[PDB]
Amino acid sequence: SEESQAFQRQLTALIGYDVTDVSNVHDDELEFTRRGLVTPRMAEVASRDPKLYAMHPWVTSKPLPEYLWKKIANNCIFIVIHRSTTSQTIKVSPDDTPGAILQSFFTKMQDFVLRVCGRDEYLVGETPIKNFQWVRHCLKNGEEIHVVLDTPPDPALDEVRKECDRKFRVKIRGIDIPVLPTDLTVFVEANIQHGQQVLCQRRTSPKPFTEEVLWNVWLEFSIKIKDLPKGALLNLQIYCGKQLLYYVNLLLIDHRFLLRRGEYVLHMWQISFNADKLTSATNPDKENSMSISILLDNHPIALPKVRAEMPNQLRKQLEAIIATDPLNPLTAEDKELLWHFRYESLKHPKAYPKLFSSVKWGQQEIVAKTYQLLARREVWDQSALDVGLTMQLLDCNFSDENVRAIAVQKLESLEDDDVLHYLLQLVQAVKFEPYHDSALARFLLKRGLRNKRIGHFLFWFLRSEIAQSRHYQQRFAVILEAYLRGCGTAMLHDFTQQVQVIEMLQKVTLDIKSLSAEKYDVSSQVISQLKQKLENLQNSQLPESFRVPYDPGLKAGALAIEKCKVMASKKKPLWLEFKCADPTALSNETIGIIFKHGDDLRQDMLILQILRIMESIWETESLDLCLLPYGCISTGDKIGMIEIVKDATTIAKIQQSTVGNTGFKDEVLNHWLKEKSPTEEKFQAAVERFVYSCAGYCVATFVLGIGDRHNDNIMITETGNLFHIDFGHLGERVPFVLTPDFLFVMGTSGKKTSPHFQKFQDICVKAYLALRHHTNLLIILFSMMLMTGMPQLTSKEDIEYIRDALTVGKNEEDAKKYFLDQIEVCRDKGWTVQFNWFL
């Protein structure tokens, strides 16, 4: 139907790409994948409870941390129930089910439900109220729980629209480029890879690098055709430099298990390790990109389906190897050991990554034995879920579908709250998949379609890449389409509002950027120019309201144009403010959002996420370092939005406000806090909060290798919560930022002591070692982060930093000592590094 034609047109607009396009393809994998995702979608759609899906309660099964029970030493919790001008205050017990307090209400005073005031957040479903995230959020922030009694959302609104033993060889015909301007020479390198491991390599003779270079030469490999593993890539690379200029990959076995065959003309990617180098997609730009032509002329297949010792010491060698971190390599010895004692290895879940890296994927018989091994997976299937281990089997080192699937199998058992914690990283992992359709892609579909909060962020995480990654936009686009076709008309409506809004603000942001980037000042002309442009949108163009992308529970209404402006910084980001479109809101406070161009916010997203992960880690040990991972969503190339934290200022601005400019007085910070503090109570609270938050970010920032900072890049709220920002990496050195002013707040100085500083040192050590208790998880998150977003990755030194930072190996005692020394290095440096941040 044209109705279908228009629909697909609406989908294209939400996605930012066209899955019906075939301009940059050489086979039907994408189309095959669209069709293949149909079943996964429909099966989850039909499976989800219409009522719970509409209300998406946000719950956790994790225990209430010790530091939160402190605020409840009476087994009673106060919920403020509203209904217009009314507002009671029903006392409740932490294990009181929701529906069983509306009963300690209705009767204490029925087709209703408890909804948070001013938010699209509901407190329903059979769950202790203490297990609801919003309730833990309020408690952790000493806020009161205000709810409004109203009618459940109509699930009718989520309606889904009806729907050979020869040696392998490859002939390199030649390369061609429109124009490729000191001259030099070139050659072609054809590699057979699997899980980033060259099984075979062949090269051509060095030749003249001209707009057209031919060889018409067969490159014969030693490996046999019926030995090629499913998921093996034929990697073609061009070398010039009188080194690597262009690369392109072709899956040797397709999505149907067939051996690739025929003529191919592949448009390559130019180099300006990482995930982009592994893509099966070809450069879309067929007009001004390099291309290579090859000939392939050569029947997949299939699947069906111990006793002895492990001498004392050899077992000791095995356990030693197993205990090493994910970055500790594997000697051929290690590999042969792991493999020979295959069945002993299978009894240790942590041995799995090392084990499979020990498999000779280029040997049919061996791989065959591997599957046989995974057949008896009893131990693995019964192991306690380890996200760190699971993620390792999903990274660039594993290309085998069955190996990766057991990883996904393990993810299946994660509760929605945990999926949210790792969603960005799981989405990024899709880049390591050899085929578009994959167990991991289907898992993201299932979970997204099953819960609205996960589906919302999945949308934006996917759109973020589809809008700026030529290497993966196609794959992600198909997966996003699949999701949109099953999320519901309601959500489709919401995404439509959100996209039109951010797409308008992006235009403004950029145009204003042009009338600026003049050298700072930010003219009134430029601000006048802004207000005029916003005025235009404020009319029949900017929807009445829209959900805040990084905080789906919040609905933003009309722009407070009078409060909007252009910030006085290198980049000229917009500082917008909106009124909350929710009357039941508990305030008149506007929603502040910063729209900026100039920075790659994909990096910021990644760090902010690992920051939340570090929080959950600290929780599992009763710690609360008070981090502050504000919302941030990359919406396009060097552009995106950021949440405006209320009542906070840059530590640089605090300094400038007193010294005027440059310096650097030690008490400025303490003054500021006191002045922003009225009651003495609040401040002795704020200084406390500053000690925790400072510790948190010093530890966090040190582990991630981004501690050496810049005063203008770290802020503080009037309530004492410190927090870094901008992760744009303009960064002698220092492990982190613990300058004199910070110390002054802690009450010490000039290298001395104080209750606090000692409270600070105590918190840091506890936090540091608590992270070391998840060394593997962090190591794997760190390296994935570096490969999918910080395109500045030496598959060695860079990734290795976190090993050293986590002080891998050594013991707890030497670890604690190690960090305390770092704290000292900051003390010896004082203001030197800070000051040096200008030359």
UniProtKB/Swiss-Prot annotation:
Residues 306-486 form the PIK helical domain. One of its GO terms (biological process) is regulation of angiogenesis. It is found in: Cytoplasm; Cell membrane. InterPro entries: ARM-type_fold, C2_domain_sf, Kinase-like_dom_sf, PI3/4_kinase_cat_dom, PI3/4_kinase_cat_sf, PI3/4_kinase_CS, PI3K-type_C2_dom, PI3K_ABD. Residues 164-297 form the C2 PI3K-type domain. SUPFAM superfamilies: ARM repeat, C2 domain (Calcium/lipid-binding domain, CaLB), Protein kinase-like (PK-like), Ubiquitin-like. Keywords: Angiogenesis, ATP-binding, Cell membrane, Chemotaxis, Cytoplasm, Disease variant, Endocytosis, Immunity, Inflammatory response, Kinase, Lipid metabolism, Membrane, Nucleotide-binding, Phosphoprotein, Serine/threonine-protein kinase, Transferase. Residues 74-151 form the PI3K-RBD domain. Pancreas, skeletal muscle, liver and heart. ATP binds at residues 592-601, 627-635, 723-729. GO terms for molecular function: 1-phosphatidylinositol-3-kinase activity; 1-phosphatidylinositol-4,5-bisphosphate 3-kinase activity; 1-phosphatidylinositol-4-phosphate 3-kinase activity; ATP binding; ephrin receptor binding; identical protein binding; protein kinase activity; protein serine kinase activity. The keyword Cell wall biogenesis/degradation does not apply. Residues 566-572 are annotated as: G-loop. It comes from the Eukaryota. One of its GO terms (cellular component) is cytoplasm. The modification Phosphothreonine is found at T775. Residues 560-831 form the PI3K/PI4K catalytic domain. It is linked to Immunodeficiency 97 with autoinflammation: An autosomal recessive disorder with variable features. Affected individuals have childhood-onset antibody defects, cytopenias, and T lymphocytic pneumonitis and colitis. Some patients may have features of hemophagocytic lymphohistiocytosis. Candidate target in therapy for inflammatory diseases. Selective inhibitors and protein ablation are anti-inflammatory in multiple disease models such as asthma, rheumatoid arthritis, allergy, systemic lupus erythematosus, airway inflammation, lung injury and pancreatitis. This is Phosphatidylinositol 4,5-bisphosphate 3-kinase catalytic subunit gamma isoform. It comes from Homo sapiens.
